[PDB]
Structures are given as C-alpha cells and as structure tokens.
Design a binder for this molecule. Sequence first.
Ligand code: MG
Ligand code: MG
Lengths: 320, 324, 324, 320
Amino acid sequence: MQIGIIGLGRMGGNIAVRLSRHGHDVVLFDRDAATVSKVSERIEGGRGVAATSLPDLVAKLTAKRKIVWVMLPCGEITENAVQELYGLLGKDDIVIDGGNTYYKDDIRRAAQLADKGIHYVDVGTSGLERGYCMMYGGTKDSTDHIDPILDALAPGKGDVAPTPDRGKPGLDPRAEKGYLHCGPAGSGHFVKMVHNGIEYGMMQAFAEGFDIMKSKNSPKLPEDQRFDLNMADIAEVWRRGSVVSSWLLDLTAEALAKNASLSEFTGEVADSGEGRWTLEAAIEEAVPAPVITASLFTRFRSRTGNNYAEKVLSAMRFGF
Amino acid sequence: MQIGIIGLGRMGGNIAVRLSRHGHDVVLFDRDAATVSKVSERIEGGRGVAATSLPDLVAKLTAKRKIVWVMLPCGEITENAVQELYGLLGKDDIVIDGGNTYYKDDIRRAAQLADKGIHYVDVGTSGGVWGLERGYCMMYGGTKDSTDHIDPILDALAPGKGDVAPTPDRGKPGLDPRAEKGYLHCGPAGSGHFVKMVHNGIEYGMMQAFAEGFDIMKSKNSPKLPEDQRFDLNMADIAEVWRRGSVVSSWLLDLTAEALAKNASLSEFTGEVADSGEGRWTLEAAIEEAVPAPVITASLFTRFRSRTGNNYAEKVLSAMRFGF
Amino acid sequence: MQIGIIGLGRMGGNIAVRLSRHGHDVVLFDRDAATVSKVSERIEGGRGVAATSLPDLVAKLTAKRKIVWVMLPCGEITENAVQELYGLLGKDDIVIDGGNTYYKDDIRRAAQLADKGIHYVDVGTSGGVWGLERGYCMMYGGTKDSTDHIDPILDALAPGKGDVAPTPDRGKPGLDPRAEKGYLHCGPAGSGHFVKMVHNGIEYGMMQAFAEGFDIMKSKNSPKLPEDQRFDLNMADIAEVWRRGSVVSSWLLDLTAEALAKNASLSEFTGEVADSGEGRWTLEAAIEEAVPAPVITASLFTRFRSRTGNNYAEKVLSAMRFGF
Amino acid sequence: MQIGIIGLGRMGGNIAVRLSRHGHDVVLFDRDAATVSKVSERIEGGRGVAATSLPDLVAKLTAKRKIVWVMLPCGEITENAVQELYGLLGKDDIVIDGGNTYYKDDIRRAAQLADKGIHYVDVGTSGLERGYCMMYGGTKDSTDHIDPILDALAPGKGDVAPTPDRGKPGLDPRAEKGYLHCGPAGSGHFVKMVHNGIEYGMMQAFAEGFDIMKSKNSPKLPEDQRFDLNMADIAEVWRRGSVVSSWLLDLTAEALAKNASLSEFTGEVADSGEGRWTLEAAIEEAVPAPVITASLFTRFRSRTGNNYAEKVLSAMRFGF
Ligand SMILES: [Mg+2]
Ligand SMILES: [Mg+2]
C-alpha cells in the first residue's frame, strides 16, 4: 500500500523506514527539507517519494483511498495539518493521527472529518527494528483497510509465552501481534493515555523502593541499623525470576550499572500530559487513583524548590 | 554438598527436590512425618534421607560444616527452630533462614549465634510459583565466609543467566557477577530479608498501578458518564496487546492478561485483599529513614479499606456534612 | 437600596430576608409562586415586593442601576436566567451570581455581558447554616465600579468584625479592611467563585484529617489488636476537650463534638459521602497549575470509594495475587 | 497542694508559675541553676522552693503523697529522671510525665513503677495565661488525687458555646473544662499523638489551598487564565463565618498579613515524632490514613533537595 507521512521526527522517520522495509510505499513531508532528504536516503530503494507541501503530498497519493499519517507536535500544529487535510481529502480517504493527542480532540476531529466522508484513526504507540505496540481507534471500515500498514509496524507475536485462555470469540487475535483496535475514534489515544499513567505508577513504585534501600545507609540512622546496599546489583538480581521483572526494571539496571549513585541526574522530572489526562479521566469516572496521583504530584514537586504550601507550613509553625 | 532442611511446606519441599536434582544430599525434617515421606518420594537417586527429629537431622550431617536450612512459618515457630539449633550446632556451622522473617529478627539471631561461632544467613526468595523448574530469585545476607561456603547450594537454586539480554557496563569492581545468575549476597545478616521486603513493597505498588489503570478503563463505560463520553473497552485484549513492545511489559502484566483472558469480569474474586508483613515493614523502613513512599502507602491503605465496609472515618464525614 | 432576587431556595430566601432586615427593598421572584409568597411573608416593614416573572422583576427595579441577584441551581438553570437578563438589562446594570457556579462560566458570562455594558459579579458564600442571623462569609469578583456600588448590599449580608481578636499588622496598603468584616472583593469576575471553590477544597481536607484521627482512636480498641495494646477511648469527650485551648480548635471540631455527643457510634450515618463540584474543580486547578495537592485528592478519593463496594481495581489485585 | 517540677523549659516554667498563681506550692529543679532562679523569681511570693538535686527535691515534698511532674526532653533524659524517681519515691506517690513521650514507654513505665506502688500519669498538653488543654492517662486513684492541679492548669469552660447534648452519663464534664482523663496510662500521650496527626493534616489542607490560590497567577498559565489573588486578605475573610474558621487559620492570617509572599521562610519543615507515631498506630490498626500520611511525606521531602527516588525517575526517562 501507499501512505503519506507528515512529520519526520524520530518516530515519523522510523515509521516511514519500517513501512518501506515491509513492502509499502511512502510519500514524505516535513517542514524541514533536510529532514525529508535524510529520511529519503534511509528508505529502501524506490519505495519513497518526497513531497514539498501538503497539496503536493496529497497529489502524489494515487491509490483509490488516500491514507495520510500525521506525526506532528500535539496541539495547534497537528490541528493545522488535520484541517488542511480536511480541505484536501475526500470521501473514504483516511487520516491517521499518531501523535500524543488528547483523546477528546480525536473524537471531535473524527466527527468533523466524517461530514466529508473522511475517516479518522487515532494511533497511540508505545522501534524501527522491534516494532510498535499500538492502540488505535476508528471505524471498522477504515481500520480494516489499513490493517496491512499496522501489521507491518507491529512487533508480531514474537517469542514470549502465549497467554493460555485466548482462543475464544471476543478476543481479537491481532492483540497477540501487538496492535489492537480499541473501539471508536479516540479510544486508541485513551488506552495509550492510561498505559502511560500505569507506567508512571510503576516507575514511582520502583523509585520509592530504591530510595528506601539507598537510604538504609543513612547517617540519620544509628550505625548499627544501617546496611550499605548495592543498588545496581539489586536491580540486576531482580531481573531474573522475581515478581518485579519488567522492561522498566531492565532500564533501571542498565542506568544503575553505569552510575549507581545517579550523581549525573537532577531528579527534575516532567509530565508529558498523559499523566494529567489519566487523572482527569479518573475524576470524571469517580475512580480512586492514588498511585497515579502520587506519581504525578511527585513529578510536579521535583521541578520546584520548596513551594508556597511548604512556606505556609513553616509560617504556621513559627506562629506557634 | 550435604544440607539439612527443616520445614517441608510448598517452598521447603520444592527446595529440597531442586537441591537433590543438582546432586546435593539433603536430610529432610518436618514436624509432620507424613510430609517428610511425601517429599522423600519426590527425590531421586538416593540423594534424600528422612530424619526423625531436629537433633536426628543434625546428627545425620557429617560434613565439617553442618548447614541447616529453616523454612518454617514466620514468628515463634522459626524462632523455636533457630534456638534449638543454637543449642545443637557449633563453631562454623551455618543456619539459613529462608522464611519471610522480619529482618530485625535476623540481625538479632545472627548476633546471638555468633556467640558460639555459628553463622547465620538470611535468604529472601522470590518466584515461588515457577521456582522448582525455573529457579528462585534470591537475596541473602551473612558473613562472606559462610556465604562463600554455601555458594553451590544457592547456585543450584537460582535461575541462572538464562537467555535474556545482558545488562551493559557490568564489568566493574563493586558489581557482583552472581547477580546476573539471580542470587545476590546483599551484605551482612538481615540485608537479604530487608531487600526482599522492599521487593514486595515495590510489587504492591506495581500491582496497584495496574489495578488503577484497569479500573479507569473499565469505568470508561460507566452509566454515570454521558453516553457520548463512553467507550466499551476490552480489558483482556488491552492487557494482551501491552505484553509485546510496551513500556509496562512485565511478569505482573503477563499474569493479569492470563486472568483477564480466563474471565474478564473477575467474577470469582471478592476484591478483599490481605497484606502479609512486608508492605507494612517496607513503610516502617521508609518512616525510619524519612523517605517519602506515597505509592507503597497507597497500596497498603487500598488493601486495608478493601477488607471493610464503610469505616468510622466515613461515618464522621457524613456526620460533619449533616452538621452543615 | 433596591435589589431583585431570582431563586428563593433556602439561601435565596434567607438572603432576601436579611437584606430586608437591613432596610433594603427587595423584589422577589422564583419559578414557583408559592415560594415567592412564603418568602414575602417573612419580610417585614413593606420592604419586599413579589414579582410575577423575570421581566416583571426587572420592570419593578426603578433605580438608575438595576441590580439582580441570581441564586439558582448550578448549570443550565442559572445560565438561562443570566441569558434572559443579558437581554433585559442595559448599560451599568449589575447581575450577581450567588450560586456555586464553575468559575470559568463566570469569566465567560462577564465577558459576554460587558458587550452591553452589564457588569457581572460572582459571589461565593460560606456559612449558609447560621447565615440569616450570623451573616455570610463572602468572596466576590467583578469590576471595582460595580462592586463599590453594591457595597451596602454585601455589608448587610456579611457577619461584620464581631468580637474575635483582630489580626495584627493589617494597617498596610494592599490589604482590604473589608476582609475583616467577612466580605472580600477577590479580583475580577470569576475570582470570587474560584476562592470559594478552594475554601471548600480545604474544608474537604480538614474534614478528612479529623475523620482519620477519629478512626485511629476508635480502632485503638480493635479486636484485631492484642488485648494489652487496646484503649477504649471516649470519642465525644475527646472531641469536647479539644474544643478549648488545642491546636485543632475549629468550627468543624465544634460540629463533630456535637454529633458525637448526640450519638458516638454515628449509627445513623452510612458513611457514603457525595461530592459536589468544588472538590473536583479545586483538584483541576491544582493540576492546571502543577501544584501538588495530595490531601485534597485523598479526600476526594475517599469519597469516591465510600460510595461503592469492592471495585474493579480491587478485583484485579485479587486476580494478580491468585496468579502467584 | 504541693508538687515537684523537674524540667524548667518554656512549658515547665510556665506550669510552675501558673500553679503558684492558683494556690499550689511548687518545688523546682532543672539541671541549670540559673533557669531555676529565673523561675523562682517568676513564682508568686513564698509559693516556691528551689531544690538542687532530685533527692533534695523529693526530700522537700512533705505531703502524704509526693507528686513529681517531669517535663524533660523525651527519650533518655526523661527515662533517667523516671528511674531515679523510681528509686526515690514510694507507695502511693505519683509521677507525672508531661513530655512528648512515645505512649508505649508510658505503658512500660507505669507497669514498672506500679511494682513499688508508685502511680504513673502521662499528660499530653496542647498557655501561662490561657491554660493548657490536657489529655491524660493513669489510674482513677491517682488522677482523682491530682485533679486540683490539673483543674488549675486547664483553661476552664470559657466563653465558647456549649456543646448541646452533653448532659448524659458517660460524658465526663471535665472535658468541658479542657482536661480529659483518657483511660489507663499511655492513653493521654496516645490521644495527644493523634491530636498532632490531625493538626498536621489540617495544616497541609490549608497549605495546599493557599498554594493553589497563589499559583493561580502562575506564568505557566496563559495570562487570561490568571488571577492575582491577595493571600492575606483571603485568610482574613475566612476567619469570620466560614467553614474553615479555626485557630490554625488565625495564625495563618497573622503570618500572611506580616509578609504575604512568605519570602522569609524556607519551607523546610520538621516532624516531631507524633506524625510518625500516628501513622504507625494506623498501620497497627489497619486504618487507612492518607491525609496524615501525605502530610508526613510532604514534611520529609521539604527538607531534602531532589532525592534518590527522583533521580531514579530521571534515569529511567533518559534510558528511553
Ligand atoms: Mg503488609
Ligand atoms: Mg467534588
């Protein structure tokens, strides 16, 4: 199949390359022509066309149904591209938003684009060589049509042990290949958002445990209550056969082996948006979510010094 | 090597069997003689001997250094066995406590046993489910002399390096290569059960992170939501897709996908969750050390509240609300 | 002064009565004419007039600047009234919204109304229980011109300085002396409902702090504790003793002591706690501003969980635990 | 009555003065003789005796039942005094511990002292002019005996509105005077400990709200979503007729009126012990206590920079 790709950052460029390596043709565009030419040089021979604008890209899509994948900075930039494509595309064409879009915008865009018969698909991704775990929303018609593109990008079943009771109606076998049609437009970015919220919580659980172990050698403790524990070795031993074995643990063991004191790191952690939006979904649904909440607030506080709340505490105490 | 094992519950019996399958001679004891004979039947090649009492077990250990592994219920029972061994063993013998003992008890026991030259080793194990065939992830404390001596025993029980990708940049002093085989000498006595305790605390937090996310997704179809804000999400398929290539890929996720595939409604579970000592003890360590631990704490409190109806705090909230 | 009031529920009717007791002429309207007549009966000295519709209410306001106070259910109902007034009023008239409106709606309404020169004032009130006799603590937003004009109305409704000790060091520029009387111009439109929203968020946290402490004390007699670690504590007397000279002395404590004196078991309350918009909206503001707010969040989540049985998250926890 | 007082810090000295002003005789001791002489000069004429040691103090207590109030730094110092008094006192004498003692130590001391017939009373206090709110444990015999001393120190009923349904058996009228016999030894310091835990939670609730209001003018917000709110005026207006009116609010309004930016404060807040012990009691009892927990953890984190947990988070993110 042929697909246009707008946005050639790390993920957009890699997506184009992996598609071209799996027998699909790509039409490439990015605001920066040097990035366009770099990705063109990375794409398998003759599997690619470079466009110079969005209209030129659309004109270069010659299949019955034009498919355009947008991988742009979330927000106004992605919205601008979507509206321009809304003007340039027509009935049964397909727009895929692979960005970290707030899922409610996906619901809105899909409704607008449907007034012209344009199908909207939101893809949340979690690479070039290993494939992309994908959670996506849209109509059955459009997601069926683009199934070959997604199958090309997905990791496939791999060598992990299969989940035992999966042979039943209601369970989509494509989930075992690492890509899942989650429901209508917006549901893919919604599931990806919660995936990131869970990830935040897992990260904070590990981070707290390692802090507790590191601080078991604290001067504030009496010497006979101290242990001088080896952080990198503990992360490593947990990699094999423990209940906490996980991709996150693997990363932590690599970072601790490099520099166990973590002296090279500030500890100032951003939150990309998905954490906040996960908490908002919890609020909307009256779901208690203390772990994702604690993870988000730890991130907020890591970026400031002492904040006004803490100054209020000191002021109250002094007033005693 | 020859090793005595007292306590033949699931873990003790499995440990005896795996040791014997790696060619070690094991002397078996349990308060219930029928359990001793059940475990003996599982050992092959004559590498198992049934003892009739704890003194008889000790008498059957003929090596220069007697090694006795205690795998009993936490608390008074383990303590009784350790005190009896204090009386029965002598200089350079080794007592291993493999239960989920509170690590401060290990510090006290090792100091006492050192009075007679008896070495005390605390072993914390993870992975008890798949352990017989797949091996045990182990975190253990004690003196270098004794833990060096029992290295073949621990290596027999550990999973080995396996086929996972090796961690980069480990060829440095300070980093124990045995960690890559799944068993780690953590420091002096008590440090093994301390590290295992924190492992469980982290596990609590990871479990709660998943449980919250799945609750949010499940309730995206809630009647309380406007119809046009709902999604009817497939919990088992979402669990499954995250298994391959995602940031939350993990053994806990594998279990969750299996449970959800079996029955997505989780019909068969009440939701009333117990907590063993380790979550509480991890939070105690955080407090002692002035470490913020909101995720482990939230996991513990969620468990507390899952076991009750509305509690007194909530009734106080209602009374205040009525008051204005 | 003359003022129209639309919405004669508990708060609207009480506000009309107190205004009239301070000599203001009030024009009354409510969708239910029987409520209008009930409130009219409570006004003395001819200072109340019953209107028959919102346009009739507006027609009965003969001052240079028409002032209309809207005290209706949050949401579509208040919005309908505000839009109708946008059509009926003109330059320099004043619309006051006294409900618990989401403050972003106040920002939008004030911008729209300024198209016709109509001034919009948001008033957040606290103390609705004792308000008729004791006055209303008020937080309000709008232009200086309009809020200056309605100052006698707000002063009539406020508690006044009373007999509490004055706050030291308030004789400074930047500090509004009206704050000492219990009504504060908080800034532009929306800022009054914003400050009131945060007031309620703090209240949630204070309530939960007390509720947790009382739960800890009540459960100090728990059967799960060893008998020699129990205390049988008297909740109502502990509440009472804290009223005089303690750090937790507060109106919430006064209410709690009263409720516990009435019935210490709190037998009559389920513990299932609702939450109006303000707790959620306070947390939304914290998120927007990247402010950690763990206590307000914990109070909200406690309320969520008080209303359900075991939820899906807890069933996921049970399923994972069974898995190993 | 006559009472010996050991420990003449702020509270010990004030307790001695207030007793002497209410018709009781005090015998004073402190390790620092200059502090002894300062308090002696503050005590009403001839209501006082200065002792030079614990034995001299006990010898100067000539009543049938010797009462000794210990107001010393918690821990080894208080324990040393209690053991020395255990040696010096006898049957039906009374030892009062007014410090911030961990209540389990009170249970232990009371049992030891009872082996000689010495009664042990723990008093938790929450001053000179206004009186002390007191929560105390011990036997009915000893607490009855010292009731005049406690009544002298308590605030009395004052001018606040009386709690309506208080005229019933089971409700101790002394609670309305601001001192409460809480049960056996240890129960007073236990109730005081939870009082402090509640106070922490109340403080953190206010502190969070003021932080939210202060940060409503944040640069990170778009200008049209900002309010520049007056912190001192908001605290003040809430003092009269609001649901949050409280002693803590009064203190906050005074601090904000002095310096609304709170520029003079670090925000580095200690935790004295009661917060931790409250949380431990919650754990022991399987009681969820997220608000007191969040308050304690905010204090822990206010005293450090970025901690090892946060560095673990940065390391994981970089590993992506
Ligand atoms: Mg636990
Ligand atoms: Mg709410």
